[PDB]
A paper describes a structure:
It comprises a core β-barrel capped at each end. HBI forms as a result of covalent rearrangement of three residues resident in the central helix (Thr65-Tyr67-Gly68).
Deletion of Ala227 has little impact on the general structure of S11, with residue removal accommodated by another residue contributing to the β-strand and the termini shortening by one residue. The result is that both tyrosine residues are now closely associated with the surface of the β-barrel structure. However, apparent increases in flexibility around β-strands 7, 8 and 10 and the perceived change in stability do not appear to have a detrimental effect on the cellular production of EGFPA227Δ, as this is significantly enhanced compared with EGFP.
Residue numbers in the entry: 4 to 64, 68 to 226, 228 to 231
Amino acid sequence: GEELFTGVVPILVELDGDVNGHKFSVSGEGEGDATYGKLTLKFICTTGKLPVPWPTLVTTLVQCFSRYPDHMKQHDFFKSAMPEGYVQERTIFFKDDGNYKTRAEVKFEGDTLVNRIELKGIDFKEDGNILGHKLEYNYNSHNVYIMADKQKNGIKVNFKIRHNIEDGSVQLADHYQQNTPIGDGPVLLPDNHYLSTQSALSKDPNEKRDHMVLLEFVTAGITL
């Protein structure tokens, strides 16, 4: 599965969402170069205006593109599940607000790495930070904690995202994630470790559709 990521791999992302009954779709295209832990993607809201802030969707919108140091290669669950793929489920709890529940499949379709996602958001406040579009268009760096989930033959991941608001407060988004293989082939169950992630958000000055350009670098690390 690691051999599939030695070069530049095209990526396709499709999200079908519904948040407090607001339906929307997002499509994304770009490419990933896992040797450098690098992702380059452009996402479009194909249904018109996106009803939630772009930053709230970043985690949902392919951890197989992380750079795993040579010394940690035995801990790369994400690549090991390929090409058959993995199921990625989350609940994201927005503090003092609603939650997203997502289910995605990440796998190859021919040469393309595809991330197909369904998202449902419930219990959001209609003039809160999410539905009221009060989050800054930026993104902090942080560490993602990966643990084996031996019983489920997969991993559990927990992490908190802090979305900056212009008063100097943050909107917390607490993530609980599970990943399981689609195939029944062998996978790598890791020891506890983390992914250091950084994300830069931007706009295409020639793009009239509601969109997000995203550049991300991710490198694993482990404590000895």
